[PDB]
Amino acid sequence: EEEQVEKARLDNELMRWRRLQRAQGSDYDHWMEAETRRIQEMA
Amino acid sequence: QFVPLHLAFPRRHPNSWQERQFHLLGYVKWPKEIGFYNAGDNFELTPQAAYRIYKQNCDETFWTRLHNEKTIIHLLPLVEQDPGTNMVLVDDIFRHHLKRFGADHYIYNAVMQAAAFAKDFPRCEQLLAEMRGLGLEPNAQSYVNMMLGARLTGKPRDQAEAFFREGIKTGAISAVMRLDTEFQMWMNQLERLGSFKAKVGYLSVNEEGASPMPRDMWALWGWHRTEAKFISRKQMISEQVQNRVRSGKELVGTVYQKARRQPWAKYNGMFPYDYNGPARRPAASFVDAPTPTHNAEVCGTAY
Amino acid sequence: VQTGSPTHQREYERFHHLPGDVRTRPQFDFTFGETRADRVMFAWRKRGDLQL
Amino acid sequence: CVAALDASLQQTTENTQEVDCLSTWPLFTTIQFLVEEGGLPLGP
Amino acid sequence: DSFKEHYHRVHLPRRLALQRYARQQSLRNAAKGNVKAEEV
Amino acid sequence: EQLPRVAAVAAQYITGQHRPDFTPGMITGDHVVIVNIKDVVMVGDQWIRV
Amino acid sequence: LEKAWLYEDSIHPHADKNPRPLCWTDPEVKGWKYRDPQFIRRWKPNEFMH
Amino acid sequence: IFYSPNVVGELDKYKGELLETFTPGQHTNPVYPVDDGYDVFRKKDKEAMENATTFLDLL
Amino acid sequence: SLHANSLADDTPLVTTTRTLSPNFRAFALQDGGVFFTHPSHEQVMRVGQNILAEETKATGMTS
Amino acid sequence: YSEARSNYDGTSLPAWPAPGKKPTYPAALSELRLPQPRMRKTRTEWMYYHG
Amino acid sequence: QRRSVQGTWNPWLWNYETERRRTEAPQWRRKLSEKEWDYYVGQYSAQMKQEE
Amino acid sequence: DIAFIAPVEPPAADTPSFSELRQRRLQLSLEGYDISRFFPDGELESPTVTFAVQSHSYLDPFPDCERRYTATPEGVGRGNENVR
Amino acid sequence: QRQIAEYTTDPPERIMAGVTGEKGPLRARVSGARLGLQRTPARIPWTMQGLHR
Amino acid sequence: AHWERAIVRKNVDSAAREHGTGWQHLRNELGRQNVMLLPRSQQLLAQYEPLAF
């Protein structure tokens, strides 16, 4: 039970970490970088 | 720490946003004769409207045994109030069920409960015998219908104990305590339930919300704000398709999923609609509706 | 310009007549809690190598 | 057809006489063959 | 007269009146001939 | 009802502006009793940012 | 300002003055243009004749 | 001050049509209360204020 | 207001309908004016008093 | 007494239609050669229209 | 000198006069006729058929 | 005799929610016929849709090959996108 | 009667007829009938809102 | 003149709001119907001839 609770807590931490990195990497330079990379991928 | 991330109180939505979101989700304000939102803000369909939609959609390809069961369920209180005329409607439903789907535990248990409310214990016995003859073994629902009919008609404690012991022997009802305590528990449950006329049971409470639109559209049923009691029709259809595609994961509740469900790490940020109000969408107009001929008359209660 | 109290007119709305980034909501709000040493109340998004 | 027969039986029972009426015996024989040899549930 | 000072100066008699109205409900019981203290 | 809207609606009846014989000198008005102020609602993020 | 009677909860001692439930409409209510709903047209015998 | 008008006839308010007859008893335009029930947040006034018919002045 | 009703030339902008609106009768004049017939001040005040009494007869007349 | 005068000769169009017939109404939208935007006549335009 | 022939405005003149509607609106608590029953049940069944 | 018919839906189905439903189902549809040109509302698969007439006219043959020779929808359904 | 039951009943329904979950009956059995989607409680948690390919 | 006309306009607007309309619609419809009543006369009627207003 403790291992399951700890694993769920780690998964929630990973979720919130991805959410916070979506804003950390949102610095206009890296954001434009990812945007033009996605544009070249779809094109 | 003292600065709150989320806030449940005070509220974050005025009165106009209630109507805006109600019209945005895709719901329609039906008249009271069709249905309304009860005290628990749950949508409730009038038995008359249930029988009407039954008569109109009994021939379509999407009708189902479960739909007939729900129609009998909606008719149950009217059957309890007037067992003379509403039993005719129940019998018509059973006739159509035999025409389309045939013998089924669902329809048989539904008509057994209908007879139990209508105070027809000979009819309940006949239905049980018909199930046994057709080969549909009596289920736990059938034995509980037996017990309810016994308690309602006035059959004695030993008469109900006979059916409970028969259910135990058959195995449809699983008991984890002594038989006496199990029967006591079932009888206390049925006594707290009561009937639509016995002034003690829950069914005696006829108070209703009587509101065409729920009071709080952002009411939560679970834990987080994303588990809203009222959602859009696209998301509702998503839930409906998930209930059938992933019916296996519903069987087990594991502590992993339990601790994952905690929304302490879920994002709670103000979307643009949290500032601009719910997006304005047109409501379903009813210009094609005929003029109300009895607009001056007052509509009565459901049951 | 100042045409109201901070309850209604924010401090970053004084330069609302000037064109550019001031016509948007600032990201950082240092006006609450402890006051800064240099008395900075708002800071906009870091555009490239410049920040307001 | 059996629903029509049930409606007719209800009509003829809603009115000694109900036993000696000549109409009750053909319907009786029909439903007797239906439930004895046929196996109608008779529930509805 | 500051904002808070004026607010309290105009609201304190109203607060006392509200407390009096609250105790009027308690006095309702002793008025009917059944003096009963408040239960918590 | 939102705080600024309810405040404006209350003040329009407090100051007596809704009366056709309203005179700036004569301060006459109506007594407005505001109820359920604890359940007043402002749109999101305002309770924290204002 | 002294003519406003604020009350946190719903209870209030001003029951003798009999306050009328003031009704007010906010200036926000506005119906944005929506798509004209399509419905069947009801004809006429004289129209079909001529 | 004296006034002596030349009336043409009874005129309808809610409809621009000029009535050809005049009846001093019947209301030229019946007016009904506003209470639908569809609106849950409709600010309810007092019952007698919402439901209060009027007299007939011409009679 | 509403744009579809505002653009209409037959529907004026002001839309007020009250209890005494049917009592207010309209007639046409030859010069183009409108002659209105309304209840008197005593009659309007009497109607108001009757409404007040009909409202207060249930809960008793307070101070 | 009084003078009801709109033009030089005191004549005007029939202001009241026939009993039962539909009345005529002026133009509410401003005299604009473009259909958009639809704008209600202001009071000064109403004065200019009435003369 | 000021004077009124019809009467001086007083706060209790148009106080009890409330708003109304042009014509009769369909109530929510009303006895539905057979035609209305058929119409509304048909609309409900149609939207349910599309959802299904 | 020419009749301009068009697909119509009940008002309970003409809500924008079902409109978005149909648009999504058509953009996800795998059928060959072009959705943008053929049946952009889905009047062949929807059960509640009914083909109703909106305008009525007649065409008379010319005296050379065998009194109006041109037909155009009028009144209800004039210049609409669904009258197809 | 038996032949009509076997001819109308499908493998999924005849499999899920006798199944019961931990919260009660199966959600599929409970929501198999929907007299308008406004009557559906929508009892799916936020961890199960997602749907795989 | 600005303050005086603002006062008279506010009084007329309050008198119209007590009936159910506003200064905007009242003024526009007066201009339309070609009544030609100055705000001073509108205020005088609102204060001393409520039936006429």
Q: Looking at chain E, how many residues does it have?
A: 40
Nearest residue, CB atoms, B247 vs list M16, M22, M23:
M16
Q: Give contacts of K44 with chain L, Cβ < 8 Å.
A: 12
Of C6, C5, C4, which is closest to residue C31 (Cα–Cα)?
A: C6
CB-count burial class (<10 Å; 0-12, 13-18, 19+) for L48: buried
Per the CB < 8 A criterion, the answer to whether B221 and M42 are in contact is yes
Measured distance between the N- and C-terminal CA atoms of chain J, rounded to whole angstroms? 24
Residue type for position E33: G
Joined tokens for residue D26:
């053909």
Per the CB < 8 A criterion, the answer to whether B57 and B70 are in contact is no
β-strand I25-29 against H7-11: which pairing, if any?
Answer: antiparallel
Measured distance CA(B60)–CA(B139) in Å, rounded: 30
The rounded radius of gyration (Å) of the Cα atoms in chain G is 27
Secondary structure (3-state) at K23:
coil
Per residue, the 3-state secondary structure of G9-50, as one string, reads CCCCCCCCCCCCCCCCCCCCCCCCCCCCCCCCCCCCHHHHHC
CA distance G25 to chain L (A): 27
Q: For C38, which DSSP code?
A: S
Q: For K13, which DSSP code?
A: S
Per the CB < 8 A criterion, the answer to whether H41 and B216 are in contact is no
Joined tokens for residue B187:
């009888």
Measured distance CA(B81)–CA(B117) in Å, rounded: 9
Kindly give, in sequence order, each residue whose CB lies less than 8 Å from that of residue B282, ignoring residues fewer than 6 positions away.
Answer: B23, G34, G35, G37, L15, L16
Per the CB < 8 A criterion, the answer to whether N51 and I38 are in contact is yes
Per the CB < 8 A criterion, the answer to whether B276 and F44 are in contact is no
Residue type for position A39: I
Q: What's CA I58's distance to the chain center, in Å?
A: 26
Peptide linkage before J14 cis (omega within 30 of 0): no
Chains K and M form CB pairs within 8 A to the count of: 10
Of K19, H54, H20, H11, which is closest to residue I23 (Cα–Cα)?
A: H54
Residue type for position B10: P
User: Which residues, in sequence order, are bridge partners of residue I18?
Assistant: K19
User: Which residues, in sequence order, are bridge partners of residue M25?
Assistant: M20
Of B114, B257, B130, which is closest to residue B196 (Cα–Cα)?
A: B114
Write down the H helix ranges in I1-63: 3-7, 41-56
Angle at B56 between CA B52 and CA B62, to 5 degrees: 120
Per the CB < 8 A criterion, the answer to whether B64 and B74 are in contact is no
User: Which residues, in sequence order, are bridge partners of residue F34?
Assistant: G6
Is the Cβ pair K22, H34 closer than 8 Å?
Answer: no
Kindly give, in sequence order, each residue whose CB lies less than 8 Å from that of residue C9, ignoring residues fewer than 6 positions away.
Answer: C2, C3
Secondary structure (3-state) at H10:
strand
Kindly give, in sequence order, each residue whose CB lies less than 8 Å from that of residue G28, ignoring residues fewer than 6 positions away.
Answer: B16
CA distance G23 to chain H (A): 6
CB atoms within 10 A of CB I52: 16
Is the Cβ pair K36, B289 closer than 8 Å?
Answer: yes
The rounded radius of gyration (Å) of the Cα atoms in chain N is 10
Region label for I32, one of left (φ > 0), alpha (ψ between -120 and 50) or beta (otherwise): left
Peptide linkage before C6 cis (omega within 30 of 0): no
Write the CA distances from N22 to A26, F11, N31, integer angstroms. Answer: 50, 18, 14
List the single residue in N with minimal CA-CA distance to K11: N18
Q: Give contacts of B29 with chain H, Cβ < 8 Å.
A: 38
Measured distance CA(B127)–CA(D44) in Å, rounded: 9
CB-facing half-sphere around the CA of I27: CA atoms within 13 A: 16
Joined tokens for residue I4:
């579809």
Of J50, J34, M42, G30, which is closest to residue I6 (Cα–Cα)?
A: G30
The rounded radius of gyration (Å) of the Cα atoms in chain B is 23
Q: What's the count of helices (H) and strands (E) in chain F, helices before strands? A: 2, 1
Residue type for position I61: M
Helix (H) or strand (E) holding E17: helix E3-31
Nearest residue, CB atoms, H49 vs list K18, K22, K27:
K18
Measured distance between the N- and C-terminal CA atoms of chain C, rounded to whole angstroms? 19
Measured distance CA(K41)–CA(C46) in Å, rounded: 59
Measured distance CA(I52)–CA(I16) in Å, rounded: 22
Kindly give, in sequence order, each residue whose CB lies less than 8 Å from that of residue H1, ignoring residues fewer than 6 positions away.
Answer: none
Name the one residue in this structure whose structure tokens are 């104990």.
B161
Is the Cβ pair N32, J42 closer than 8 Å?
Answer: no
Is the Cβ pair G13, E10 closer than 8 Å?
Answer: no
Q: What's CA L12's distance to the chain center, in Å?
A: 19
Kindly give, in sequence order, each residue whose CB lies less than 8 Å from that of residue B126, ignoring residues fewer than 6 positions away.
Answer: D42, D43
Measured distance CA(B8)–CA(B225) in Å, rounded: 9
Per the CB < 8 A criterion, the answer to whether L16 and B282 are in contact is yes
Secondary structure (3-state) at H33:
coil
Of L14, L5, L71, which is closest to residue L46 (Cα–Cα)?
A: L14
Joined tokens for residue J20:
């039962």
Of D20, D19, D32, D25, which is closest to residue D2 (Cα–Cα)?
A: D32
> Best interface-test mutation with I: which of G16, G17, G18, G34 has the largest number of I CBs within 10 A?
G18
Examine chains K and N and say if they touch (3+ CB pairs below 8 A).
yes
Per the CB < 8 A criterion, the answer to whether L2 and L71 are in contact is yes
Residue type for position N17: R
Per the CB < 8 A criterion, the answer to whether K6 and N48 are in contact is yes
The rounded radius of gyration (Å) of the Cα atoms in chain L is 17
Write the CA distances from L27 to A21, B234, L33, L42, L47, integer angstroms. Answer: 33, 15, 12, 11, 19
Angle at K27 between CA K25 and CA K31, to 5 degrees: 130
Per the CB < 8 A criterion, the answer to whether L22 and L43 are in contact is no
CA-based torsion, B247, B253, B254, B255: positive or negative: positive
Kindly give, in sequence order, each residue whose CB lies less than 8 Å from that of residue D5, ignoring residues fewer than 6 positions away.
Answer: D27, D30, D31
Of E35, F18, F48, K32, which is closest to residue B268 (Cα–Cα)?
A: F48
Write the CA distances from B156 to B151, H24, K16, L26, integer angstroms. Answer: 7, 74, 64, 62
Of C27, C32, C28, which is closest to residue C6 (Cα–Cα)?
A: C32
User: Which residues, in sequence order, are bridge partners of residue L3?
Assistant: L56
Residue type for position B62: F
Kindly give, in sequence order, each residue whose CB lies less than 8 Å from that of residue I13, ignoring residues fewer than 6 positions away.
Answer: I1, I6, J40, N24, N25, N28, N29
Name the one residue in this structure whose structure tokens are 């601009």.
B276
Per the CB < 8 A criterion, the answer to whether B43 and B217 are in contact is no
Chains H and K form CB pairs within 8 A to the count of: 30
Kindly give, in sequence order, each residue whose CB lies less than 8 Å from that of residue B57, ignoring residues fewer than 6 positions away.
Answer: B63, B67, K45, K48, K49
List the single residue in I with minimal CA-CA distance to G36: I4
Per the CB < 8 A criterion, the answer to whether C5 and C25 are in contact is no
Measured distance CA(B270)–CA(F16) in Å, rounded: 38
Per residue, the 3-state secondary structure of chain B, as one string, reads CCCCCCCCCCCCCCHHHHHHHHHHHCCCCCCCCCEEECCCCCEEECHHHHHHHHHHHCCCCCCCHHHHHHHHHHHHHHHHHCCCCHHHHHHHHHHHHHHHCCCCHHHHHHHHHHHHHCCCHHHHHHHHHHHHHHCCCCCHHHHHHHHHHHHHHCCCHHHHHHHHHHHHHHCCCCCCCCHHHHHHHHHHHHHHHCCCCCCCCHHHCCCCCCECCCCCCCCECCCCCCCECCCCHHHHHHHHHHHHHCCCCCCCCCHHHHHHCCHHHCCCCCCHHHHHCCCCCCCCCCCCCCCCCCCCCCCCCCC
Is the Cβ pair B16, G32 closer than 8 Å?
Answer: no
Measured distance CA(K38)–CA(B289) in Å, rounded: 10
The four Cα atoms L50, L51, L56, L60 give a dihedral, to 10 degrees, of: -160
Region label for D39, one of left (φ > 0), alpha (ψ between -120 and 50) or beta (otherwise): left
Asked if the C-beta of B245 comes within 8 angstroms of chain A's C-beta atoms, the answer is no
Secondary structure (3-state) at C47:
strand
List the single residue in B with minimal CA-CA distance to L48: B60
Per the CB < 8 A criterion, the answer to whether L8 and G39 are in contact is yes
Residue type for position C26: P
Measured distance CA(B236)–CA(N53) in Å, rounded: 55
* Residue-wise DSSP of L2-52: EEEEEEE--TTT-SHHHHHHHHHHHHH---SS-TTTS-SS-TTT-SS-EEE
Name the one residue in this structure whose structure tokens are 């839930």.
B239
Kindly give, in sequence order, each residue whose CB lies less than 8 Å from that of residue B146, ignoring residues fewer than 6 positions away.
Answer: B112, B116, B124, B128, B138, B160, B163, B167
Is the Cβ pair A11, B267 closer than 8 Å?
Answer: no
β-strand G4-6 against F32-34: which pairing, if any?
Answer: parallel
Per the CB < 8 A criterion, the answer to whether B67 and B101 are in contact is no
Q: For C17, which DSSP code?
A: G
Joined tokens for residue L32:
């060959």
Secondary structure (3-state) at N46:
helix
Kindly give, in sequence order, each residue whose CB lies less than 8 Å from that of residue N10, ignoring residues fewer than 6 positions away.
Answer: F17, F22
Per the CB < 8 A criterion, the answer to whether N16 and I18 are in contact is no
Per the CB < 8 A criterion, the answer to whether L26 and L42 are in contact is yes
Kindly give, in sequence order, each residue whose CB lies less than 8 Å from that of residue K37, ignoring residues fewer than 6 positions away.
Answer: B33, B52
Nearest residue, CB atoms, J26 vs list I9, I31, I32:
I9
Of N48, B64, G15, which is closest to residue I41 (Cα–Cα)?
A: N48
Region label for L44, one of left (φ > 0), alpha (ψ between -120 and 50) or beta (otherwise): alpha
Per the CB < 8 A criterion, the answer to whether L3 and L56 are in contact is yes
Residue type for position B212: P
